[PDB]
Design a binder for this molecule. Structure first.
Ligand SMILES: Nc1ncnc2c1ncn2[C@@H]1O[C@H](COP(=O)(O)OP(=O)(O)O)[C@@H](O)[C@H]1O
Ligand SMILES: Nc1ncnc2c1ncn2[C@@H]1O[C@H](COP(=O)(O)OP(=O)(O)O)[C@@H](O)[C@H]1O
Ligand SMILES: N[C@@H](CCC(=O)N[C@@H](CS)C(=O)NCC(=O)O)C(=O)O
Ligand SMILES: N[C@@H](CCC(=O)N[C@@H](CS)C(=O)NCC(=O)O)C(=O)O
Ligand SMILES: [Mg+2]
Ligand SMILES: [Mg+2]
Ligand SMILES: [Mg+2]
Ligand SMILES: [Mg+2]
Lengths: 472, 472
């Protein structure tokens, strides 16, 4: 178990790190370099821990047992239009980006949805909260419903931790690492959706920007598709505007080829959309191809929607008659507070101002680097208290897991032995034809770990690194 | 079959190349960059063809059916001391490098061989000669008995060619690519040798320079060892001099750890040895650890020894009573000429001077970039004719295979559609305890291809790229 003990001897560290890095590159745990995000002529290893972080087996089991419930929940939200408008009514007057996303959802609702096949590829993230007894409890940090990444690379890292332990003759521990293959499962969902669309020669369209350091993780899904004779074409929103078009039955065509599924790897942040990219996203949502996620499902992944769902009776109204599901889901909720104009918002603000190390302030963003904490959160709250703008955020109880030592490897920086905390993610996959759920599953996990000084996180954002859960 | 047809459309080429490269990096077909040969912080794909080159199945079968014979042959040569001294008697007065190798072999013979376990990991290379009928015939180019590389990377590229064909929906052709796993087999030989040495905690010592772009191909063998709980330590000759020592029973110790097998990845060229590296190689050959190859076996891989073995009755005297083996081996020999002082040497020189595009002039070197052809060969022959120095070389019939179009991918250069020729290699593995052959096998193949303008070759030397034999 204890890694700290293996991290005190320096010559041995340098050697195990050398071992890990070479095995990681051989297993395909790669990213393009930051200096040339459009080129695969040169690449490096994605950041990762030297050893797999210990994770309570019961919590890992618990995270897995609630994924099917969260896939149901996200899918009920995306279909209940009144819930989404009421939930986001205040956010959309203050947040341009949520307004545009919501406005596409509205135009689409208006014209009628062309698509008849629906699917979600997501990742639900949790932390381990020290509880009353002392028992760590599984608490949800967020749910990611657009461009849920790192499932390809995560299938490749276990071999890397087994290797590091083998070098030290810890064959027992090496043997306990869990094998994990999420990209197979994510791919199977797009496969199912393609099958159901029903056009033998239609392609899966992957939406990605040209500067994309994480191409290998996307290629992994493409490899699993390609093995089942489903072809993917990669294109940017700009490409869609120049070459995407709808036929008479609203079929999407790209370069004359028919698209069955639109898998988004881009478009979860405002910086990714110019005026024309917004038209291309509307164009894709208006089409008959299955969308991954469709625009409503992307709205279901907002932090505001997450906060609303914790209010008593909210789970019950979305998943009526499903009390055990309701319970599994609710056990994972930590404190979530609306900051809308009103008494509840005023109270949450006063609590955050009184004990700022215990809350996080979150805008309706995705992908890391956008939440506010401690000093910045305090300063922002003091300006937001009296502004309508407050409605663009939500406030949340900070989980503060017990820190454990590990060693982080990131290209270009020396191996770093430090106190770290992890975040456990479970990938979910579901597909529905009209209103019948045809596939609903969990497909694997992702443990992301970071050095203790980072309030925020995310691998693509440069903070957390890839890891594997060592069951204890 | 015909690749030329898929190489005429430019937008599609750029796209299949992009596909191949990304799949190649994901499968671990890597080299460190040339600018930082000591760092794995950044890497690229090893050069490779876009499609697998067509290879006559009968010749590929033939190359495989003679490997066990060549392993026997190389092993008989390394044990027959009179043959080696007589063969190399003239070379050693003119070639310092062969003199030093030979001198270590002599000192070791003198002190008596400490080692009791012997093994060879090699690669026998052939080209396809247009023959009388028109039928291509398998002809040996050389046999590589020291640092026989690219067996790890070759286990990884088939998935890459299957991918490229799959993208084009040629599932039939993709299905014909042969799976290949030489590093498993090479590793099994060092494993056998370690087993036989018999010390549970002794390590396999890999001799490699610090600047080594091909580390991943070496790590592949280390991975297979590590999976069988055999540990490898990587060290340079300089490290051996500073920290290697022999005990009383001539046991090799490195940093206090006992070495069972010495696997050479360096030391096949004079530039790799300073005066102290020469002492370290002698020190390792004097030891009780199994050597891969041992110094005599390295001498058995010289081009001069190859030339001598083609003389009538020479195979017969090395492998007495083995006529079918003799025949399989002899069928692969092309014309080989001694250039020693004397009538035969004068005649070969006159033939080479009369038709220089048909011969190659070879020094006793290894690894590519050292032979002489056409203009340089002619100029060298005119100076060597009357010199004692002529004995440092041998002359050989050039094989001129039919060229076929393929596309070569090399990092930093645009995909290049060109006429190419291939070289088929078969990896051999054998182990012997005292005088009993305990393992003798072929373990996989390596197809190396190059653009037609290159007289010479080799992947590490920058000319040939990795490929796969498409059986026709
Ligand atoms: N409630 C929380 N307790 C602890 N850390 C949190 C909490 N909320 C957010 N974070 C930290 O910030 C990171 C990013 O926040 P997140 O809610 O997941 O939004 P994003 O969609 O930007 O990832 C998390 O992975 C975690 O490191
Ligand atoms: N006899 C030959 N016919 C054709 N090409 C040859 C011949 N001999 C050498 N070469 C070319 O030069 C390369 C290097 O020669 P080789 O004999 O294999 O020595 P090295 O040990 O340097 O590889 C070969 O892979 C091939 O491209
Ligand atoms: N361009 C990347 C990044 C997308 C991204 O960061 N996705 C978020 C959901 S919005 C996530 O899964 N990131 C995980 C990680 O960064 O830790 C892609 O498709 O890989
Ligand atoms: N440093 C390299 C290069 C050694 C080398 O070039 N080996 C030769 C035998 S001397 C060979 O197999 N080379 C094949 C290739 O370059 O095509 C190593 O261990 O990989
Ligand atoms: Mg997150
Ligand atoms: Mg998120
Ligand atoms: Mg050669
Ligand atoms: Mg050679």
């Amino acid at each position: 178990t204890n890694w700290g003990s293996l991290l005190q001897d320096k010559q041995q560290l340098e050697e195990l790190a050398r071992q890990a890095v070479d095995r990681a590159l051989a297993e395909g745990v790669l990213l393009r370099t930051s200096q040339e995000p459009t080129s695969s002529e040169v690449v490096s290893y994605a950041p990762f821990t030297l050893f797999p972080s210990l994770v309570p087996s019961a919590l890992l089991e618990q995270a897995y047992a609630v994924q099917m419930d969260f896939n149901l929940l996200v899918d009920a939200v995306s279909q209940n239009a009144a819930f989404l408008e009421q939930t986001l009514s205040s956010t959309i007057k203050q947040d341009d980006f949520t307004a545009r996303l919501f406005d596409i959802h509205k135009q689409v609702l208006k014209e009628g949805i062309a698509q008849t096949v629906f699917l979600g590829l997501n990742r639900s993230d949790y932390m381990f909260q020290r509880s009353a007894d002392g028992s760590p409890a599984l608490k949800q940090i967020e749910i990611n419903t657009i461009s849920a990444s790192f499932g390809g690379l995560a299938s490749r890292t276990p071999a890397v931790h087994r290797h590091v332990l083998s070098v030290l003759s810890k064959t027992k521990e090496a043997g306990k690492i869990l094998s994990n293959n999420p990209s197979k499962g994510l791919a199977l969902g797009i496969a199912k959706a393609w099958e159901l669309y029903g056009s033998p020669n239609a392609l899966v369209l992957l939406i990605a920007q040209e500067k994309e350091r994480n191409i290998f993780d996307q290629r992994a899904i493409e490899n699993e598709l390609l093995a089942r004779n489903i072809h993917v074409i990669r294109r940017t929103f700009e490409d869609i505007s120049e070459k995407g078009s709808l036929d008479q039955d609203r079929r999407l065509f790209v370069d004359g080829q028919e698209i069955a599924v639109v898998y988004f790897r881009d478009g979860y942040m405002p910086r990714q959309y110019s005026l024309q990219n917004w038209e291309a996203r509307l164009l894709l949502e208006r089409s008959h191809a299955a969308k991954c996620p469709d625009i409503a499902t992307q709205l279901a992944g907002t932090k505001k929607v997450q906060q609303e769902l914790s209010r008593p009776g909210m789970l019950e109204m979305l998943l009526p008659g499903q009390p055990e599901a309701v319970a599994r889901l609710r056990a994972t909720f930590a404190g979530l507070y609306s900051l809308d104009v009103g008494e509840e918002g005023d109270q949450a603000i006063a609590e955050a101002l009184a004990a700022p190390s215990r809350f996080v302030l979150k805008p309706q963003r995705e992908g890391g680097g956008n939440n506010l904490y401690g000093e910045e959160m305090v300063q922002a709250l003091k300006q937001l208290k009296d502004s309508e703008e407050r409605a663009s955020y939500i406030l949340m109880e900070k989980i503060e897991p017990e820190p454990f030592e590990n060693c982080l490897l990131r290209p270009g920086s020396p191996a770093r032995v430090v106190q770290c905390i992890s975040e456990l993610g479970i990938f979910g996959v579901y597909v529905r034809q009209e209103k019948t759920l045809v596939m609903n599953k969990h497909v694997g996990h992702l443990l992301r770990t970071k050095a203790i000084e980072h309030a925020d996180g995310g691998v693509a954002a440069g903070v957390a690194v890839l890891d594997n859960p060592y069951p204890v």
